[PDB]
Design a protein around this nucleic acid. Structure first.
Lengths: 203, 201, 53, 89, 250
RNA sequence: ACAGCGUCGCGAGGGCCGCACCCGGCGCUGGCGCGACGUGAUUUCUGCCCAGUGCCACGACCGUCACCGUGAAGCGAUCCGC
RNA sequence: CCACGCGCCGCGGCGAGCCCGAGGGAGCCCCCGCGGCGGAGCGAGCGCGAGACGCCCCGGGCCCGCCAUGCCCCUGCGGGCG
RNA sequence: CGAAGGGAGGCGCGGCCCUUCCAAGGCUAAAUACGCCCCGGGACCGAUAGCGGACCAAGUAGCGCGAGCGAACGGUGAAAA
RNA sequence: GGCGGGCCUGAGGCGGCGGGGGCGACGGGCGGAACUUAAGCAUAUCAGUACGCCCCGGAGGAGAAACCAACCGGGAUUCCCC
């Protein structure tokens, strides 16, 4: 009942009410460290939509990601090579700030598994995402069939393999149909199959 | 040969030939693959000994104006077709009929095709229940291959009256066909001329 | 085979033929060098089967 | 061309599978919007369009809307809602 | 192609300060409740020589207001400071060479050393040998005091800032000629590795922008643009004028 | 190289450098200082030339010279102004 | 040397056809087995669309498309005919 | 900078349709790939060949500060008689 | 201003359970060349390759249409033939 209303008020982010609420929050989040554990999901409605359930073994972690573009790791700014690789600061990163957020908490806590992440706040220099992590050995999680899949070995460190939602978007998986045909099993797997020279026995 | 008259080759240069992912796929395992698929098929057949390995699939017009005449096998029977026989989707799956909610018949003739296929399968199917009935099960005989394999019938000449047939075809059919084909271009150009005529006085 | 070793042509001026030689100065990596790759190595990419109508 | 030329392209009969029924927000959703707009109010850009609707005029209002929203179809409809508030204010 | 010696100095590998055996960081005493509302007695235990500085530093021992200890603070020693001298610090501090008092309190015309650019900076200006800052004026309305720094340039400093009365010792040191290369080697051993200096026109083209040709010449105007990139700024930079002219007071 | 000699920048909310970034060095420094350059102890002197090329000017504010932003016009892509 | 692509030649099967494709058949070199390629071209395209001779070859003549031109008329910037 | 019914239909833009679907949450077997290792087969090589390496002790002996490099060496006879 | 409780954020300790590192392949994510070809060489090509880093699993990824199409229409994904 209440959720269909909270969603509408979160759509109105530029409203006076939420502009104050968000300026009190960015202030606190600049005050705290980059990744901190949150007792409650700050946005319960968005967390539930992404799969949070208030049962033991589900954890929320808030992460700070630096806003901005990418600088290539180079010495003295010089990229030796053909002139098409000369640029060092103009390039923009291939993975979203949301994707970077999940992969940060993944290294900090490699025991936990990240189901999904959501946007909590942003100022000029940083963006704050909250990630839902699950303990795959917890008694409650292990015997609950809805989240048993995360306890399966294949779903381990999905943040690293880009199996998460943001990681899939970056790989282009979110879109199907024409225009996404050459990036389906993987962009490399499609490349190998399309470039394979199959020497058939009768050929 | 050396220059002279040779069409230019459109085969792309080999990539990853020395280093990198293997871009050569050899087929010396092909005969072994055949034995493997049969062995997996034989093992699966035994696991459901009375039941056919392949589920009933629907006859479907092959797509495009190129193959619109012929019919092939589709993923599943539409909910409307199953409703026509009187089978719910779940009950149909138990009988062996694959069900696809996505498919829409797109015709009334398509539904009739499949409803008749479903009706025939229902007659061919025999449900062995009664707990264990081993003697009936021993002689059950598992159907092998695709169930009710689709048959594509060849064209057969028919007899027609030239007098009645000449009634539907306009005399000078080519003029009728060429007029219909070019009507849009002829109509646009004559509108373009009406604007020019309007824009002179 | 014959590619597993590391050999570099010593170069001109050392009174030795310009064929890849190891640290010791042992000829390597050539069809004529002992231990070298065959000039055109046999591969399984060959057509071992011939089609018949 | 993108359609073959067939004089009588109708050997079969179509099943008329389609629905005019269009997604409607419903009073359930509409009630939420009325309660949320009641307290939260309009957005700064939307408020500016309301002034333009009574002052600089509709071409200007559409121009400001299109730049913000980014679609002409969406911009015209946002303008239409804001117009009902502004004109009847 | 190579990185110039200026570029290599920033890293600090062998060009870092030789801070071994340095007495400490000479600074004014901390502004505290006793300085703000009164005076803090000090005594000059010893006047010592810092390795890098050509100015004597003095270890003055003040009482510890927080505890039962006697704090030891290293101060720049203004000329005439004597072992045993009692020094007073604070808003109510007296006017004798050595005392540290708010700049506003000091009368105009006094020579003052170790002045603070902004209050409670614990020492900032006039802390070299024989260098003094003159108190030019006190704006009562703006609480701002003008001072002539040892360059001549005048800066306005909050009257709340602290300074020491007197001119730093070791004055007249530059007057003595170094005379030999050796007295220079011994001089910069205490400081960083910045001697001997090779002229850039002696270096090959790859080491310095002045570089080397068939004859030793700069080959381009020494004056280089203010916006010259790190490796380019080797000549005189932003030179408003060049050459010995005279009457430059205008 | 050197002492000597000049020239140059800079008053720390600063200069000059390091530097994928986080951050550093000079500096535990402060103009008798720190960096940058020339010339090369004395003794004796360093002339004329700012055309050119550098460099420097809240030295100006003309002419030029961007993004935005804001005018008109358009069905809108847009297009011309300022 | 091998692989793949191309040009042409020789052969072998079949012929307006031809084809161990992948596959599937308690099947092993056996059996069944699509595209494709050819059979129509030409024009950027809308589109339109070859018979008239002929041992063979070779020119000629005609036909088809494209670019014109002039006539006639229905189901008309459409058709037909030169 | 930012929506609301939106997406698409392989030439942009603004209208009008028509077909088709529902993004910004999640799972899912099968058919496919593939080395060490083990098993089997070969119109394969036959000790300067075949893996660098068939030798009871090969990444060994040796070499290079180190990263790294890198060999040589099969056969008495039926029975040691 | 002192004092008891509830909540909400936080600390220190104990338990129970998990994480870490290894495999010259396959599989996913990211960073990323150049020699080369262009008979020069910049866009290009090599190559979404080597290599660097980071994660799995017996497979992995992908996956039940905000799909393709334009029809007498199909209908998740993966591999094969074309």
């Amino acid at each position: 009942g209440a959720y269909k209303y909270v969603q509408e008020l979160w759509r109105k982010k530029q409203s006076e009410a939420l502009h104050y609420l968000f300026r009190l929050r960015t202030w606190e989040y600049r005050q705290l460290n980059a990744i901190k554990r949150c007792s409650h999901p700050t946005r319960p409605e968005k967390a539930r939509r992404l799969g949070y359930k208030a049962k033991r073994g589900y954890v929320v972690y808030r992460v700070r990601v630096r806003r901005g573009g990418r600088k290539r790791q180079c010495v003295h700014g010089i990229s030796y090579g053909k002139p098409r690789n000369i640029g060092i600061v103009g390039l923009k990163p291939s993975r979203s700030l949301r994707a970077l957020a999940e992969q940060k908490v993944g290294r900090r806590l490699p025991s936990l598994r990240v189901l999904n992440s959501y946007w909590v706040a942003q100022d000029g220099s940083y963006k704050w995402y909250e990630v839902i992590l699950i303990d795959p050995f917890h008694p409650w999680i292990r015997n609950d069939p809805k989240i048993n899949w995360i306890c399966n070995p294949v779903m381990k460190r999905r943040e690293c393999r880009g199996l998460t939602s943001a990681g899939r978007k970056a790989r282009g998986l979110h879109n199907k149909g024409i225009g996404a045909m050459k990036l389906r099993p993987s962009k490399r797997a499609a490349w190998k199959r399309n470039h394979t020279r199959s020497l058939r026995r009768y050929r | 040969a050396m220059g002279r008259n040779v069409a230019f080759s459109n085969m792309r240069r080999y990539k990853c030939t020395n280093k990198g992912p293997n871009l050569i796929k050899n087929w010396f395992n092909q005969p072994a693959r055949k034995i493997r698929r049969r062995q997996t098929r034989l093992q699966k057949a035994k696991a459901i000994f009375p039941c056919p390995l392949q589920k009933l699939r629907p006859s479907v017009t092959r797509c495009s104006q190129k193959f619109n005449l012929t019919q092939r096998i589709g993923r599943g029977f539409t909910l409307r077709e199953l409703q026509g026989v009187g089978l719910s989707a779940g009950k149909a799956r138990q009988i062996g009929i694959a069900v696809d909610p996505r498919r829409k018949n797109k015709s009334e003739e398509s539904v009739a095709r499949n409803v008749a296929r479903l009706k025939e399968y229902l007659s061919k199917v025999t449900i062995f229940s009664k707990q264990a009935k081993p003697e009936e099960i021993q002689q059950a005989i598992q159907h092998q291959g695709v169930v009710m394999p689709v048959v594509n019938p060849k064209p057969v000449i028919t007899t027609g009256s030239i007098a009645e047939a000449k009634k539907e075809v306009p005399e000078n059919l080519f003029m009728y066909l060429r007029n219909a084909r070019t009507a849009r271009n002829r109509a646009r150009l004559a509108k373009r001329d009406a604007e020019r005529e309007a824009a002179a006085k | 085979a014959g590619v597993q070793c590391t050999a570099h042509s010593w170069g001109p001026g050392r009174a030795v033929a310009r064929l890849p030689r190891k640290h010791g100065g042992i000829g390597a990596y050539a069809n004529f060098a002992r231990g070298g790759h065959m000039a055109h190595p046999t591969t399984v990419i060959r057509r071992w089967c011939r089609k018949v109508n | 061309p993108g359609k073959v030329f067939n004089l009588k392209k109708g050997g079969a009969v179509v099943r008329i599978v389609r629905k005019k029924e269009e997604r409607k927000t419903k009073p359930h959703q509409e009630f939420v919007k009325s309660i949320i707009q009641e307290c939260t109010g309009m957005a700064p850009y939307e408020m500016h369009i309301i002034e333009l609707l009574r002052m600089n005029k509709d071409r200007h209002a559409l121009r400001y809307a299109k730049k913000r929203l980014g679609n002409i179809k969406r911009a015209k409809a946002k303008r239409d809602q804001l117009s009902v508030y502004a004109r009847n204010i | 192609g190579r990185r110039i010696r200026v570029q290599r100095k920033g890293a600090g590998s062998v060009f870092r300060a030789h801070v071994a055996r340095r007495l400490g960081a000479a600074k004014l005493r901390a502004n505290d409740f006793a300085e703000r509302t009164g005076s803090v007695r000090g005594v000059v235990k010893a006047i010592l020589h810092d390795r890098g500085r050509g100015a004597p530093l003095a270890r003055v021992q003040f009482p510890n207001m927080r505890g039962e200890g006697r704090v030891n603070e290293l101060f720049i020693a203004p000329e005439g400071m004597y072992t045993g001298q009692e020094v007073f610090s604070g808003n109510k501090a007296t006017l004798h060479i050595g005392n540290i008092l708010p700049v506003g309190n000091i009368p105009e015309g006094t020579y003052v050393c170790n002045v603070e650019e902004k209050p409670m900076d614990r020492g900032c200006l006039a802390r070299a040998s024989g260098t003094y800052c003159l108190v030019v004026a006190h704006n009562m309305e703006t609480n701002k005091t003008r001072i002539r720094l040892p360059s001549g340039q005048k800066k306005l400093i909050s009257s709340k800032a602290r300074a020491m009365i007197g001119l730093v010792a070791g004055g007249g040191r530059t007057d003595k000629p170094l005379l030999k290369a050796g007295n220079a080697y011994h001089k910069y051993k205490a400081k960083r590795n910045c001697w001997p200096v090779v002229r850039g026109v002696a270096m090959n083209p790859v080491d310095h922008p002045h570089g080397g040709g068939n004859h030793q010449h700069i080959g381009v105007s020494s004056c280089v643009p203010r916006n010259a990139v790190p490796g380019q700024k080797v000549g005189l930079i932003a030179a408003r004028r060049t050459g010995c002219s005279g009457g430059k007071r205008r």
